[PDB]
Amino acid sequence: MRHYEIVFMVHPDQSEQVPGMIERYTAAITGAEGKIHRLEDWGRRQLAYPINKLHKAHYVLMNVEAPQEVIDELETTFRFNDAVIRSMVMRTKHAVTEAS
Amino acid sequence: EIDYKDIATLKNYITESGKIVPSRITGTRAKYQRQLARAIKRARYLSLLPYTDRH
Amino acid sequence: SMQDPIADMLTRIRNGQAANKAAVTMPSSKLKVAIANVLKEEGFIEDFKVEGDTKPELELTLKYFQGKAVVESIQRVSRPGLRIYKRKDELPKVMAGLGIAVVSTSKGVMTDRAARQAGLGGEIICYVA
Amino acid sequence: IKVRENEPFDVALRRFKRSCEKAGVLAEVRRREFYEKPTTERKRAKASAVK
Amino acid sequence: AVVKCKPTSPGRRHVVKVVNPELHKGKPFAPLLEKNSKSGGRNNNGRITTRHIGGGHKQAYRIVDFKRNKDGIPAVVERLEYDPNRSANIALVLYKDGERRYILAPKGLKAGDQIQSGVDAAIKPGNTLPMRNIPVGSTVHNVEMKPGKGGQLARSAGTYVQIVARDGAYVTLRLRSGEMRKVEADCRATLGEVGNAEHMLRVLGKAGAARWRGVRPTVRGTAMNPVDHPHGGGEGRNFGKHPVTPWGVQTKGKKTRSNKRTDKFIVRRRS
Amino acid sequence: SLSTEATAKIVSEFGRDANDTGSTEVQVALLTAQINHLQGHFAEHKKDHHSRRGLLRMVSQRRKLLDYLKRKDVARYTQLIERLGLRR
RNA sequence: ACUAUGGUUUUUAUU
RNA sequence: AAGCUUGAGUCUCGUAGAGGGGGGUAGAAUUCCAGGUGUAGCGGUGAAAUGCGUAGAGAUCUGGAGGAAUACCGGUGGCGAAGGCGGCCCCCUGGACGAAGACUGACGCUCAGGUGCGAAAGCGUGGGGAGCAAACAGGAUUAGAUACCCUGGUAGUCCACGCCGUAAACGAUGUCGACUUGGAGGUUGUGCCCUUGAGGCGUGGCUUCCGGAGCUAACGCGUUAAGUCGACCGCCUGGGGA
């Protein structure tokens, strides 16, 4: 298995369609012996620039260990959800411990 | 190091114009200057730092 | 890289003379040591040592005189890709009797003086005076 | 470096040409070490006792 | 995508053909056909009204949906097909609760692909919705001017139009002609681009291969008697005259729009 | 490089004694595993320059050792073509 | 703002 | 030939890197498009004209597409058969090189023929065209302007696939390897030292200047040599014709 961070932004006018994706793909990772080390809300931040009429956004931090083809099949799952703005997949750095 | 989700210490290595501070004013070792310089750019893609600096 | 065992020997005996260095080192071989003994017997060097087992090293003690080096004329007058051979009657004269040529005979390394003494020819490997 | 305080008016005067950037502070005459002193002063003062 | 033919027979060296693995090649779906009767390019009194149409060869009609049948209902593409009367060709769709229909092809090379309809549609190509729902910068085809049995603007292969502003009951958009038009927003448009876009790469290699599909070569004006076409040449084939139609009017740069009525939709016309 | 296990599947199985690489055929067999893994570099992708050029470099390296096997190893070429599918 | 040129060629030996 | 394991290459753990391939993705402004606010200017040179605008430009809001490229990071700091290569993220991967052991046993180095490859420009069959722009159509300058200067603009620059194969490809020095001189600077590993160091002492790996022997017609080279030497390959006999 491989380790990844995954830290994503939620679109404030599509936001109700995210839990039906992420709380339902936790089975698709753990069915492959993978792990999700937090999936914690990082709250509504004001942005350093307006992303074309978007200036305040909600953040979530995942922390994951999985097969690489299950994170590739999660990328198409984030893209087909469209309420999420970048998955921000980043390699290695090992698993999080003691709540960071 | 390993994190760019917080910036309150990372901003110490950025100019008021948003560009990276030269290591010779901070005494920072060149391997860590390179890491901090790329970490400052990584934090722009999480929208925690601007790209401009036009007004 | 390294084609012949003495192509790095003659230069290291000729060089270091202006700084009057009393010693020089080089990698050691059967032919280098067989030459070092005759260069001591003819008074061109004062001592030679071998040091090692699997890739040995050779140190030569160089000879000097009042304000001067002693080995002022040393050349191969042959090349490893196009070697020089002579018959027992045809071994080369050097400085019309004031120098000596070095020959590799079927009885080892010796001067042309000593090869003609025995009645032998061979390969010519150095000219010294 | 850029403008960060004014507020209804600024010093201006050749803004950042031979003022506040390059000679003084690095280059040409290399005097008064203004680039490499200000952190050493901030390292040693500090209070350093009883406010 | 198109490919060049081998010189296995005379003249074939110059031929280019269109090939699509997802194209059915078998027969159309039999309940969704009619014969499409033709009036031959002539009125009830035997006189020519349309020319170059004589000498046709059998074509049908796929009962093609321009009437926006089953509005607000989702569907799926089952197969891709050819249509002799529209350059974008056709697709066959199966609707949510039963039955098929043929639709003007949205850009795509696949089947098993779903589509949505009305204000519950996603902002994705091939979906059909009222223009009052689409955001500025959106591309659309088959955009509709009035509800009815037909459908207007952006239907030829590879065409689309893009919307630049929205205010009240109307939207403002940029045409392929260079015209700028302000159209009614309740009208049902399809997202993205209309399919094929390779229709002008057709060669029609053999001189009989235009004829066997009902296409007629147009009769050259200079080759006629001067009293049957005013452009007719002399015995030495000499030109010596300004270009004209078979009805005596000049054509090189001469304008013909005479309407003064369709003002509501006008912003800035083509230039 | 080849994995420690895909290496062991040659250097601790194919030689004439335990962990033998002094049988010249083991130097040809390990390269026949490395060149098959380099022909495995593709999918995903086809047009990688350093792998298409490095694949031909492993052909140069195999022509070196196979010509030597039919030159200085007496008879061991006909004792190897029964164990390597060099003619598929 | 603001420019193009003009062929060819020469001068001692001697203690 | 058989043993040795000094030349050369390799694995385990490790180092730095704008080296290459395949997929994704982002901030601004020049531009284009539609409506407000409010007016006649804008544009451009040595100085101007053609032009954009006056039928509503420039500027400033409002609301969005379209295209090429990636600020800082950046350091005589790094990598790559050569050519050449700096966004940020993922999926693959060559070379070089460090510690301590284990291994092949000459496996090196050179190379005719052959087959390999691009910084720009061009060609085939189609797409896409902001910033610029052979040719093109104007204007000014002029004696004329094909040139300076200026408004627009095609092919091209971008993209998919097959061709093109070149150069001041010049780091002008074909290549592997060893020895050696006076003084500094930069820069990546590993050992040793209670770092008693606010950094050295060894040993690998890397690297820029300034002297000096030898070397040159003169500039230059200078331990990373054009110095000292040895082997493999390749090339050469006046100018113009050409």
Side-chain angles (χ1 to χ4, degrees), chain C residues 11 16 27 37 53-54 62 64 67 71 80-81 91-92 95 100 111 114 118 123:
Chain C
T11 56
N37 174 66
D53 185 30
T54 67
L62 300 183
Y64 293 86
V71 186
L91 310 178
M95 296 189 177
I100 24 165
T111 53
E123 191 188 335

Side-chain angles (χ1 to χ4, degrees), chain E residues 145-187:
Chain E
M145 289 173 177
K146 282 185 177 191
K149 69 182 186 177
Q152 304 79 19
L153 173 66
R155 289 166 49 147
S156 308
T159 66
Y160 63 94
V161 299
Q162 201 166 4
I163 85 164
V164 293
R166 71 201 294 199
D167 180 32
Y170 291 83
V171 295
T172 314
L173 59 73
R174 71 206 299 201
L175 306 196
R176 289 281 297 169
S177 57
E179 173 174 315
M180 180 61 58
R181 200 179 183 95
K182 188 170 71 179
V183 301
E184 287 181 81
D186 198 72
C187 300

Side-chain angles (χ1 to χ4, degrees), chain E residues 246-261:
Chain E
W247 307 276
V249 296
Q250 293 175 5
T251 62
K252 187 86 82 181
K254 189 169 170 56
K255 299 186 187 297
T256 55
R257 179 183 165 86
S258 299
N259 177 281
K260 302 175 76 183
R261 192 188 70 254

Side-chain angles (χ1 to χ4, degrees), chain F residues 18-32:
Chain F
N19 195 245
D20 170 46
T21 63
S23 293
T24 306
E25 302 103 291
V26 186
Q27 293 178 336
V28 180
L30 184 61
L31 184 59
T32 297

Side-chain angles (χ1 to χ4, degrees), chain C residues 38-114:
Chain C
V38 296
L39 293 179
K40 187 184 176 186
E41 193 175 72
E42 303 304 315
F44 296 117
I45 61 169
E46 304 204 279
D47 170 63
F48 63 98
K49 288 187 174 185
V50 186
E51 186 175 66
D53 185 30
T54 67
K55 200 182 192 172
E57 188 179 49
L58 169 60
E59 191 177 48
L60 306 180
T61 297
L62 300 183
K63 195 178 181 171
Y64 293 86
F65 181 63
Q66 49 183 101
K68 215 79 181 297
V70 179
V71 186
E72 303 192 81
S73 298
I74 183 167
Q75 291 299 348
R76 196 172 185 151
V77 206
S78 182
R79 69 186 295 170
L82 186 72
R83 292 172 180 268
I84 300 292
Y85 304 95
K86 287 294 190 179
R87 300 290 292 165
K88 67 204 158 197
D89 297 291
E90 209 175 86
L91 310 178
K93 283 185 176 178
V94 183
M95 296 189 177
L98 296 183
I100 24 165
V102 187
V103 191
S104 189
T105 79
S106 60
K107 297 186 178 179
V109 180
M110 58 180 59
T111 53
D112 84 289
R113 182 191 70 222

Side-chain angles (χ1 to χ4, degrees), chain A residues 28-99:
Chain A
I29 292 163
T30 53
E33 306 175 69
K35 292 294 190 185
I36 307 93
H37 303 139
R38 45 163 57 95
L39 193 68
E40 279 164 38
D41 60 284
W42 269 53
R44 187 171 182 254
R45 205 201 188 272
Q46 199 182 269
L47 303 179
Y49 75 97
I51 320 182
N52 61 94
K53 295 179 176 65
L54 172 59
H55 203 199
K56 299 185 181 193
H58 187 73
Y59 288 71
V60 181
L61 176 62
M62 187 175 185
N63 297 116
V64 67
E65 180 184 31
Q68 193 265 115
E69 276 277 273
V70 175
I71 301 302
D72 206 73
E73 196 173 294
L74 179 59
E75 190 62 22
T76 46
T77 300
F78 276 125
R79 289 167 180 244
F80 196 80
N81 183 249
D82 183 63
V84 176
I85 312 174
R86 292 192 71 178
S87 66
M88 206 64 62
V89 59
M90 70 191 80
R91 73 201 192 243
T92 71
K93 310 184 300 185
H94 192 56
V96 300
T97 55
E98 301 191 328

